[PDB]
Paper text:
We carried out cryo-EM study to delineate structural changes of the Kappa S trimer, and obtained two cryo-EM maps, including a one RBD-up open conformation (termed Kappa S-open) and a transition state (termed Kappa S-transition) at 3.2- and 3.4-Å resolution, respectively. For the open state, the angle between the long axis of the up RBD-1 and the horizontal plane of S trimer is about 72.5°; while for the transition state, this angle is 44.1° with the RBD-1 appearing less “up”, and the other portion of S-transition is in similar conformation to that of the S-open. Moreover, the population distribution of the S-open versus S transition is ~49.1–50.9%, in sharp contrast to our previous findings that, for the WT S trimer, the S-open occupies only 6% and the S-closed about 94% of the population. Accordingly, with the downward movement of NTD and the underneath SD1, the fusion peptides (FPs) of the Kappa S-open were also disordered as in the other open state S trimer structures. In the meanwhile, the up RBD-1 slightly upward tilted about 3.4° (from 69.1° to 72.5°) relative to that of the G614 S. Interestingly, the analysis revealed a “breath” motion of the fusion machinery, especially in the S1 region. In the collective motions, the three coordinated NTD-RBD pairs (including NTD-1/RBD-2, NTD-2/RBD-3, and NTD-3/RBD-1) tilt outward/downward simultaneously, thus the entire machine untwists and appears more expanded, which could release the protomer interaction strength, beneficial for the transient raising up of the RBD and shedding of S1 subunits. We showed previously that for the WT S, the core region of the up RBD-1 (through Y369/F374) can form aromatic interactions with the RBM T470-F490 loop of the neighboring down RBD-2 (through F486/Y489). Here for the Kappa variant S with E484Q mutation in the T470-F490 loop, contacts between RBD-1 and RBD-2 within 4 Å were reduced to just between Y369 of RBD-1 and N487/A475 of RBD-2, which could disturb the constrains between RBD-1 and RBD-2, facilitating conformational landscape shift towards the fusion-prone open state. All these may render the Kappa variant S more prone to receptor binding and subsequent fusion.
Author numbering:
A (entry chain A): 641 to 676, 689 to 728
B (entry chain C): 535 to 620
C (entry chain A): 923 to 1147
D (entry chain B): 729 to 827, 854 to 1067
E (entry chain A): 826 to 827, 854 to 873
F (entry chain C): 292 to 340
The structure:
Amino acid sequence: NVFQTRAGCLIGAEHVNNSYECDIPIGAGICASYQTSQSIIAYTMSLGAENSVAYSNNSIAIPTNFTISVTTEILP
Amino acid sequence: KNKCVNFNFNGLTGTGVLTESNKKFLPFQQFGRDIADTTDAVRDPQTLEILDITPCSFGGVSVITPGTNTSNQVAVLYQGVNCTEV
Amino acid sequence: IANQFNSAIGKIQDSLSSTASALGKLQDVVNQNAQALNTLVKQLSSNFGAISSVLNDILSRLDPPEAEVQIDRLITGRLQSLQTYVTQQLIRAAEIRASANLAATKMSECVLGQSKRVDFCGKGYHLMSFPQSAPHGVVFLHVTYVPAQEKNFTTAPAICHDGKAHFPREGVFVSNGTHWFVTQRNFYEPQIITTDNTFVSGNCDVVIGIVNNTVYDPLQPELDS
Amino acid sequence: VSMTKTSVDCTMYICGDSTECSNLLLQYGSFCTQLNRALTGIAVEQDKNTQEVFAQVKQIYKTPPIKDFGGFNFSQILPDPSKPSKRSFIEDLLFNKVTKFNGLTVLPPLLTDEMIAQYTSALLAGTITSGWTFGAGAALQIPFAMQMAYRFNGIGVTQNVLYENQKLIANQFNSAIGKIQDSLSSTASALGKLQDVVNQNAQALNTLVKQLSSNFGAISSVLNDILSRLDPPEAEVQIDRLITGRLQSLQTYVTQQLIRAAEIRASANLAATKMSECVLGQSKRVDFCGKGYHLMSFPQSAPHGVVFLHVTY
Amino acid sequence: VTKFNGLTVLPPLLTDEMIAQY
Amino acid sequence: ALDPLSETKCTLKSFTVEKGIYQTSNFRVQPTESIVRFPNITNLCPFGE
């Protein structure tokens, strides 16, 4: 498990082509996580799912329902 | 004990209030230390007892007074301590 | 709205009770102060180039002129320790004063009144907020309006009836595939197209994408009756 | 937004390859350890700025293959897939105009430039199709012609102006974007605000290295020379002078970085605030999004920063 | 959410009760 | 040393004392007496013999 990155040589991490959400930040868009017989793995940070919004001159979306959400914010 | 004094025990010195604590030193341990590596306790070299070191009362002196043109009355405030000198 | 709100407050109690790391922003302030104090004290045990860190030890060994040389090293180094401590406290104080100004701003825009700023009071359209006391800080519970379910509709920029383009006074024009309805952007509430819901501007030969429909005039049955 | 991440080693800087010098450094306590923890925190904060700023969205948005913008031409602002790296024609200019062994380590950023462009593309593609909705909730597609109509009704202009003058607004907008490309290409000083950040870090690093050449009252600056000349007890006198001064050099560098770190974080909070008010939604604040009544803004990636193109009425 | 060398901890101006009454 | 009011004037380096609270000194308690406790002096050699 000896691989190279832009940050430097990383030993003890398996390279997974699949992109996941960043858990342990490393650098150069690379992050590590403990997952599946589980071991440390290296992967490219995923920026989130790709959403293609249907767009047309005659097309529009009107919300049919709503939800009341409560957000918690903390400040010192 | 129970007074502010300058104590010299074996090769250690210091100033503070000595009081009997509940701490227990192992037979070979003459004195303890704090997280900061400061001595919080000692064991009597002669007898067998444990004494905690409480620093003698200290704090800031704050003067509460109105404007000079108002009155010269002053109120002394000893911070971080109970009433002692008076 | 009574069930969604009450159910939401319940999740706040469960999240804060189960998850203790949500307050880590405040715990950092406590940890930073502890490290600074622990560090400042432990520097007293350092020699700073002196023979020993204890003052009485140097005074009880070296001669008066020789001791002053070693005592000066302790005074010099310990003096630098205070400068490092005070320097960090002043810098960290700037970070706290910046957060305090932010907290005072939110209470005004979020808590006291209703804020139109985008994502200042949190995601969604802000309604009102609840201030809550927290150690060395404050907590804000922001009630927001988040749209949930939507449906794709057919829209047109304007309607043409008598030859003059009609524009919505409020809302937008939508259609289910048969008749054109007026509706608000935040919710779907079909409303008949009428002279009261639309405004007459220009002609039908300008607007691009204008469509033809029947604009209902409530005055027609009144005059016929 | 972000500043160069630097990790300074207080062991190598003060004492090069020296055992005696190292033992004398331990007498000064945690100074070495503390100076490293401070810089470590600064490097972490630089990554927080990008997260709190560049990424305002949890999803990636893309434009449809059929492009109807209602007369506007976004080809300049949107990324070009023909390029090897994903960037727009404006970002291409933004990146071009803006550009050791003593124990100074340059830490790589957590977020690559390509990923930053993907954040910008998501914000750009979102505003086009979804308008102001995607930021406040689920993505709601709206025809762009109606989007500008609502943005004029917000500033007090009846939307009838758009539909009638739509052709004129298409020429003024496209002509305006063309001036942005000409200005950024001809004028290289528009980004000077970003160049000052690069120059500031360079001067601090250069100065820190030049201090090694100073004697600090010692006979010689080189440690091997002192070890190869004076006796063991005599060398300690000269080595202490070098350590004392070099210690102050690190304190000066670190102190200067923490101060500048407070300046960059203040600007980062402004960038995050503008993206929310100016980019995602429409801001009613006066002259916050720039002169004139704000309509909508285009985020654009720039080195160690971000550019905002504010369309106003 | 939760010395002897002359470091003094100053008490706050307003007690936890007062801030709760705000 | 006349009174606390004068200590305020000497702390502020001014003859006029403004309304407010000011710290003019640091209170500290000095030790009353010196205490000495050492191990027993026993285990002498027979040097007198």
